[PDB]
């Protein structure tokens, strides 16, 4: 039987006013004898109609996959607003309804610390610049690296992990060429999360 | 029915004092066909040493059966490659799953310890950081040690894929700032197959 999955917006989309948060309803395992499927949407049990359904898209396994995208008037998701996707199909006895909302509970602010490379690491041609982001909730976050204001490309970030206190932390490692680090270049870790003032913060880091 | 094959735990394959297991989980076994049968292959030679637990009903009223096979520890380290075959009368042909250690030149970890940033001591608890980077394959184990007794209150990120094809992770130890200030020596200990004696420690104190 056909199955339904409901996906949240991306953290960045809800944090920037310059970006469109979307909620996505995916129907897989749609069969060939009855291609047609509903989409009906509810933000808090009141029916909306702003949703965009794409045409059904055949798959390797010879089942269909249908996607419906609802764009959220950004402040709603960010407010704990609750979103419901409901799908029925001639191959379904009764419709399937799935619900999604922002993680429920008290937002806790992240804490941003930058760490110089270890004194050993300078025997290497590239040193690691570290940003520790800890104490935050919910897990949704965005972290980027910047130098002189302009972006920085050569960084990687861990997935959010659960600390024993019930909150999350991650680390961000930016790899720079040791010369760039030693010449007194100032590097900057930038983190976005809803519990921050202005939804935003930096911490700087230099020799 | 769906089938999932899980590797042994890194620790267990790294220390001789521990036994590595390979685990085959079958979910969505229905009540019309409670029967599930398992075939195991160590590099295409069928084995029969495996332990099947009796099936155990789940909250959703499907069954879940798990079969556990034990590895001649060096075998997982020697890249022996494992195949689970699941037969069930609701499936026309079996489901077969395979798993092994990542192949390619093993690269040694590089272990750096980092003091907490000072903006952090406004807290009663400060974080001590261990960067393990440059390692390959991803199977690894990290612990925190002080005075020989372990440290319980640490967390470690999953290994992340770096651009050069090697892995890194971080390990965070939380101690009471009083502990950090008294000159207590804290120890980051990592095990990984490219290390000498499969082992190295890296210590750090104010």
């Amino acid at each position, epitope marked *: 039987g056909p199955s339904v999955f409901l996906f949240p917006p991306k953290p960045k989309d809800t944090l920037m006013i310059s970006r469109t948060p979307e909620v996505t309803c995916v129907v897989v395992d749609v069969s060939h004898e009855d291609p047609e499927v509903k989409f009906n949407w509810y933000v808090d049990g009141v029916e909306v109609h702003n949703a965009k359904t794409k045409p059904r898209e055949e798959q390797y396994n010879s089942t269909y996959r249908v996607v419906s995208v609802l764009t959220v008037l950004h402040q709603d998701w960010l407010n704990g607003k609750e979103y419901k996707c409901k799908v029925s199909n001639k191959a379904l006895p009764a419709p399937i309804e799935k619900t999604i909302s922002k993680a429920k509970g008290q937002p806790r602010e992240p804490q941003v610390y930058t760490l110089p490379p270890s004194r050993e690491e300078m025997t290497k041609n590239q040193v690691s610049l570290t940003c520790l982001v800890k104490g935050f909730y919910p897990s949704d976050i965005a972290v980027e690296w910047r130098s002189n204001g302009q972006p920085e490309n050569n960084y990687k970030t861990t997935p959010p992990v659960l600390d024993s206190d019930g909150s999350f932390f991650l680390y961000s490692k930016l790899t720079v060429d040791k010369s760039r680090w030693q010449q007194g270049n100032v590097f900057s870790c930038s983190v976005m999360h809803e519990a921050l003032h202005n939804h935003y913060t930096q911490k700087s880091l230099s020799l | 029915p769906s089938v999932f094959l899980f590797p042994p735990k890194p620790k267990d394959t790294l220390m001789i004092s521990r036994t590595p297991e390979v685990t085959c989980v079958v979910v969505d076994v229905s009540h019309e066909d409670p029967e599930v049968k398992f075939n195991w292959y160590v590099d295409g030679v069928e084995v029969h040493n495996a332990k099947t637990k009796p099936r155990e009903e789940q909250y*959703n*009223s499907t069954y879940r059966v798990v079969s556990v096979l034990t590895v001649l520890h060096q075998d997982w380290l020697n890249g022996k490659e494992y195949k689970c075959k699941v037969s069930n009368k609701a499936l026309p042909a079996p489901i077969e799953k395979t798993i092994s250690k990542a192949k390619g030149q093993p690269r040694e970890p590089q272990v750096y310890t980092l003091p907490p940033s000072r903006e952090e001591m406004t807290k009663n608890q400060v974080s001590l950081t261990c960067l393990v980077k440059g390692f390959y394959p991803s199977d690894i184990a990290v612990e925190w040690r002080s005075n020989g007794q372990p440290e319980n209150n640490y967390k470690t990120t999953p290994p992340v894929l770096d651009s050069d094809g090697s892995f890194f992770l971080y390990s965070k130890l939380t101690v009471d700032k009083s502990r950090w200030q008294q000159g207590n020596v804290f120890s980051c200990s990592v095990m990984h197959e490219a290390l000498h004696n499969h082992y190295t420690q890296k210590s750090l104190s104010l």
Partner: nanobody
Amino acid sequence: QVQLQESGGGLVQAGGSLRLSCAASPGISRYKTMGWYRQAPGKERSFVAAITWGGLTYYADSVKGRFTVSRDNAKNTVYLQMNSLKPEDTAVYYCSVDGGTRADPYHYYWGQGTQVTVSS
């Protein structure tokens, strides 16, 4: 269509007993978990009990030891036996056909609800 028609509600004083039962339309409950949920005014609907097709039972801590869920698989009806009823147990009780996990369930169908109120 599928129905889940419940019965046996009413009023009892504290420490009494009552047997809720909930009949399923044919087929719909077969091989699936049947659960009980109850809702007090000013609170959410909340979990009470559930029994798998194979007879495994799960209880909310609030009610362990005092309620007993059971099932007649052949007639498509599930039962909740309430003992040591305390004033906190006042609510509408809805029966369900359930999937997913115990910590994170999925609710296929709901019955239309019975009131059970225990006066002090």
